[model samples]
Target: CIIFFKFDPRPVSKNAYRLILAANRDEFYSRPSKLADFWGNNNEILSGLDMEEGKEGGTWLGISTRGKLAALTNYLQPQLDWQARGRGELVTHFLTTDVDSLSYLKKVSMEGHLYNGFNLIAADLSTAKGDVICYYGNRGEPDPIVLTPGTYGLSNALLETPWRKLCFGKQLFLEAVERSQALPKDVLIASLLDVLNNEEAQLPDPAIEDQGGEYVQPMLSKYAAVCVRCPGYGTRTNTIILVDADGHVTFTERSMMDKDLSHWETRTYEFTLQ
Candidate 1:
């Protein structure tokens, strides 16, 4: 389970090229993962690595000083959990690749069946690429999605698909972003935590009067929210990134020990574009 909020140029703000994003990564509590750090072909790639599958080392989200940012989510399909190729590799290869987002996506497209259903978002935040976000997924909108200046939420479903948690998370995310824009960095960090800690679930919805019978499961969606707290699986980490007009970045990461959130670790990094 994972969701992200993004603001471009911001509202009442200029320099849309400067983008900001925040996200939560959900997974099994026991799954071992390497914390975000620089390591790759030449120790240049920075991200949390999945240690369970040694032969298929990959990450859920990561960024490189070379000006690449990427994230991935698993799409539930028939037998995907067992048959799919290691999905994390999508993000790993993108961050380490020397080519542009579109070019890399073209390459990933060729090996569609090798992997299970998945969603991948690639961005070229380099000064040369001017903050471009491209989304490609086997089970999403049939084409590459070009994200504009706005907020977005992603979970097990397709991008911006109006699922329960996605809808609630996006609204809370927007509010948090608005509050942080005018406040100090400390306040911004607090706001990010506030949203991640929200457990208020949105109730299910009845079918529309005009439409046939339909329903939504409020509690089910709540359980699958940003900071999921299921039995064997739950949210593992929360990461937020802020990019200013000058290309300075403030990246924060929070790793949890358990679902109750009794024990956790937080780290922050401040750096300018290379």
Candidate 2:
């Protein structure tokens, strides 16, 4: 049930971009970009495998290319007869292969029939052709669109559902992003996750709800993984080591305090490029 959102400032510093990571591993889980796994392999290309596994999953919402550019969001299913697809399959494939990010998206847009639903975004920090786009998984917003600069509080159905925590939090979020100076990658991630994990808990339903703060699904790794669910969205460890045009790499981690939001942490790194 881990989820995340991001901003892609392209052609970034090969050695000088920001990064943050967070995850709420209930079992004392210190996280890393452990690579994608199925029932058991360190497989990166997972779209086909996820689809083949169906509900078991192949979820994603992170970045690569040394974080030259990156993006992610939950997959949605619509009511339309054709709105029954998930974007994880296509997205994982694009992330693993050599195709340009935008070009790959164009291919997905063209074949709108096979998919059922989706709410996905991607970016290339180094590509001039980068932007954001979304679909109703059917005849609605057919064109890909760019996302807003700055922080965005996403909902399950995107604009359709209420924010995880509305009003008070939105004001604070805007204030934080607007006032606080961006911290080092790790600090930034910690601060960001602090907000999410520390939200006020309401009964019956929390903005980021989960039986055990997760979307249960099987995996072929040392442990099981969470499926992409609303409350549990962005509730995992993901890092983006930005390799700007100059070719430098930085490592960072993002994490939450606990299911109750009592604490949190985020970290950024500085390192040489490959």
Candidate 3:
């Protein structure tokens, strides 16, 4: 997952939104997954599922009806332990549980080594003290951070590490947020999705390229682009989530319909916080 988000922790008002997010899920075309939807027994969780054999029921991004939200991005490394826990479960676990953002992240930090590298942002939006968003990563920054109101970008690196694509996507996301101030809801969402659809390739970051090892070196250019497009593996989904001042939530996902990337289907869910 490559994600960009703007969080406003201030009191909700007519002039400002609570949160805005745009993310892209990149993966192998052969991996089976379900589109975003309300999936829990009582439709408590809304997110796409990783249907792959061993990682079934995991998610890259998700929100709960009870006002929980979580998103995750993998940290790039030369070699990965296939037997390690799937990072997508990090997001799903946060969304489905009742734990507060800070506590859950602290627990995750304690057991971080059991899984491959990952960066996670979790939030509990139903708190009386406004929303609480925290960031925790297994590969860097040993402690969890209770994020202040601001814009943030996360890709295959530690949070805000200034990768080329992350910076590019952040700027476009900010511009889209600004344009959203006066635009209609549908138009605003369209602009946000467009930001995730960016395909402008950037010069590969030497630091990242060097760490990717031989297997990832040839694909560095593709990964450098905000929208990755390759033969069998690429950006598979673009998701936009907006939470307005009144606690209304809008989640929209555009997913590739086939392995050839010839078609796409959009799914959206709208509801107020419980």
Candidate 4:
């Protein structure tokens, strides 16, 4: 799945405040996945892939053609059953299921203990139906809460949980949005993407190592930084989805093949709101 960090900068909830989500997918390089397509049990669901072990056709994050949005992050914890359903399936089920955000979240709550801890966000951004944002976490809360118009942060922890790197990234994101206030949509998106690509972190000497050569655990802390580039696990994709006031939605998914984050493959979709 994706290890994402996102926020919606606009505080103006007047006409359903615009939603802009920027996320970075931190995963093993071997997990086969397609960038973005209508690949799932139901073709109506458009999202990135988890490829092989898709127990429930689990997806990292996605948008339905029916105007729903969802994304997820793992919750770090110990003493887990490990036999629970894959957390990615939560986002996948939410996308394909024919239920409202709140109702489905309630269903999830009833069965949350059967799965690993996770932070899930579901939203009906369709202007016609109410613009609703709901947050659910198996480890955090029992009831789903509506997300007010404001910037929020997420990592391998609870929403807005003060992980140093997480907060640092959020601060950078807020500043980026502030600086982009007067610019065009492209500029604003670029600014946010830059934040996701930020490499500033608390680096340790010799980073991480073991008899096998270098270890991956060392980067988990600095990995808190938006873009991670460790040994085998790192941020593979950077995605930006922006739905503006005029119903012009722009979704840009940028991906890198490996640790060398130089040139990337960028896929973009621009369409009017249904």
Q: Top lDDT: which candidate number?
A: 3
Candidate 4 similarity to native, TM-score: 0.84
Q: Candidates sorted by TM-score, descending order?
A: 3, 1, 4, 2
Which 10 successive residues of model 2 have the least lDDT summed? 218-227
Candidate 4's residue-wise lDDT over 1-274, tens digit each? 2233333434355333277778887877777777776654646666787776645367778887677788888765533565787777788888877788888888888888888778888877675655677889887879988887677887766787766667677788778877887667788778988888887764442322221123335555556466877777778888888777656677888887654557678888876667
Deviating ranges (above 4 Å) for candidate 3: none
Off by over 4 Å in 2: 1-57, 66-71, 75-86, 127-140, 147-149, 159-172, 178-183, 201-274
List where candidate 1 sits over 4 angstroms from the true fold.
Answer: 7-17, 41-43, 205-222, 258-260
Cα lDDT of model 1 by residue, 1-274, tens digit: 6667574643345533266677778777888776776777766566778888553478888877777888888764324346657888889888877878877776777776688788888888765447778888877555576778777887766787666667878888888877776677777778977787776655452211111122113225545456776666667888887777767777788887544468888877776667
What C-alpha lDDT values do all the predictions have? 0.71, 0.39, 0.87, 0.71
Return the top candidate by TM-score.
3
User: Candidate 4: global Cα-lDDT?
Assistant: 0.71
Query: Where does candidate 4 stray beyond 4 Å?
Result: 1-17, 39-43, 54-56, 78-81, 202-217, 258-260
TM-score of 1: 0.86
lDDT of 3 by residue, 28-48 (tens): 899999998898878889999
Query: Could you tell me every candidate's TM-score relative to the true structure?
Result: 0.86, 0.52, 0.96, 0.84
Q: How many residue pairs clash in each candidate?
A: 1, 37, 0, 0
